Amino acid sequence: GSWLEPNLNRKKKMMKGRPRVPTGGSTKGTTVVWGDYGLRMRDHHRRISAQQLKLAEDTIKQRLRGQKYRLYKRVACNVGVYVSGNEMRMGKGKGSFDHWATRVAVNQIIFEIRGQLHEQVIRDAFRLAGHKLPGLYEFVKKGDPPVVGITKLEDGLTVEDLKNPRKK
């Protein structure tokens, strides 16, 4: 399969589900691991579709065409969305397959790029991909600390300092 079309069966339906909301101090997926830069969702957790992620890649390729780069995708559309007709009435079972989607938590990286290009040339690519993706996104470099919830672990801040009941 692929990151937009998995090797799953469309017959077996899936529940709506909910994105991951780490409430225990988890930095899972909030850092650049492969490339030099990244694109972080910094507003709220959502469920991005395979059509909104396909256009994001096409928007980055169009802006960086003719240049040497390596685009990494850190999200997979492994959630089958099933929609019943918006003209039908309530009941009569669950809806039919509509599209593949992926649930993303807050402050999680979406794309990562590694190439012999200028930083400002990559910003414009990630800036255009954010105006066409659902929500708000941010430009992230490699080496910067992870994010626990909506708070970055900057200036020596650790996950245990956030769990300490005393903060004042």
Partner 1 sequence: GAYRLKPKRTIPKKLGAKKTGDQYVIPGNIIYKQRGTLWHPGENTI
Tell me which residues touch partner 1 (CB under 8 A): 92-94
Residues with Cβ within 8 Å of 102's Cβ and at least 6 positions away in sequence, in order, are 47, 48, 50, 53, 75, 76, 77, 78, 79
> Taking CB under 7 A as the rule, does residue 82 contact RNA?
yes
> Taking CB under 7 A as the rule, does residue 84 contact RNA?
yes
Residues 103 and 52: beta-carbon distance below 8 Å:
no
C-alpha 55: how far from chain center: 14
Q: What track of x and - describes contact with RNA for positions 85 through 124 (by CB under 7 A)?
A: xxxxxxx--xx-------x-x--x----------------
d(CA 32, CA 29): 8
The answer to whether 133 is annotated as binding is: yes
Annotated binding-site positions for Mg(2+): 130, 133, 135
Residue ranges in contact with RNA by CB under 7 A: 11-31, 33, 46-47, 51-52, 55, 59, 62, 74-76, 78, 82-91, 94-95, 103, 105, 108, 128, 131-136
